[PDB]
């Protein structure tokens, strides 16, 4: 549900339930941002749909993990400026169990640290 920050007092949770059913169509997804109001602003999202470029069976196992992270869902409003509440906008292409869907990265525009939200899941059957 929740993961804490590394730099600020910001915490990220998803108001909609982290196990959810959908077909290959569109779906609504909703994220909590609660922080301290000393600089309550300037975060950005991006989903980063590219392959992390990376034993031979593990050598084709890490690639097939990454080639379904970066090909499964697509975020239909990336670079979303946040200002608390935001409804992030995805559609998924191919089906499976996308537990800890880990592409999406928010980032603080001052002192750029790659904050990750490795939470939530989506079955597509």
């Amino acid at each position: 549900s929740l993961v804490n920050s590394k730099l600020s007092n910001v915490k990220f949770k998803f108001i909609n339930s982290n196990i959810k059913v959908i077909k290959g169509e569109k779906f609504t997804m909703r994220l909590q941002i609660i922080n301290s109001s000393s600089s309550p602003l300037d975060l950005v999202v991006y989903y980063n749909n590219t392959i992390n470029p990376i034993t031979l069976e593990n050598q084709y196992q890490l690639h097939n993990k990454y080639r379904k992270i970066a090909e499964g869902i697509i975020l239909l409003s990336n670079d979303y400026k946040i200002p608390y509440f935001a409804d992030l906008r995805f559609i998924g292409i191919m089906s499976g169990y996308y537990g800890t869907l880990s592409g999406l990265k928010v980032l603080d525009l001052n002192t750029n640290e790659l904050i990750e939200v490795g939470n939530g899941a989506s079955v597509l059957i």
Binding site: G24, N49, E71, I74, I93, M94, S95
Partner: protein, 144 residues
């Protein structure tokens, strides 16, 4: 001095005549109807960018500043004449484009190249209407 336009293909019919000295206020015998400016810009700008696809050391990138105006000219034949219909036709304009000018040619001859020059200043700004600052490409594998 006109004012701004968006990315549409509009037209201009300017009010004031220029000087255009001749014998008298008789007919000019060849009046332009479609002036068509910015139909030079789409054979400037594609020869700009298709020599920007190798690294730039060409003569077209050698201290040139004729892209600030892209000033065309209107040539004619044998007094003062009110301005024609422009059909400015802006669709492919760079973001550094901010001005235009029109060095009109006032012809009269028997067997001679006896002409003059008549120049107009034009300031125009741009409505930056919509932009696509990024693209990315995703393949697919599911049959829906």
């Amino acid at each position: 001095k006109m004012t701004r336009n968006s990315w549409m293909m509009l037209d201009g019919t300017k009010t004031d005549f220029h000087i255009t000295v001749r014998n008298k206020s008789l007919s000019c015998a060849i009046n332009h109807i479609k002036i068509i400016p910015m139909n030079n810009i789409e054979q400037m700008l594609k020869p700009d960018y298709w020599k920007k696809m190798p690294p730039d050391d060409l003569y077209i990138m050698e201290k040139q500043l004729d892209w600030l105006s892209k000033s065309c000219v209107r040539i004619i034949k044998l007094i003062t004449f009110d301005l024609e219909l422009d059909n400015t036709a802006v669709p492919f304009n760079f973001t550094g484009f901010d001005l235009l000018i029109e060095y009109g040619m006032s012809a009269t001859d028997e067997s001679c190249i006896y002409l003059k020059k008549l120049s107009i200043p034009y300031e125009v700004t741009l409505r930056r209407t919509i932009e696509v600052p990024s693209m990315d490409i995703i393949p697919l594998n599911e049959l829906f």
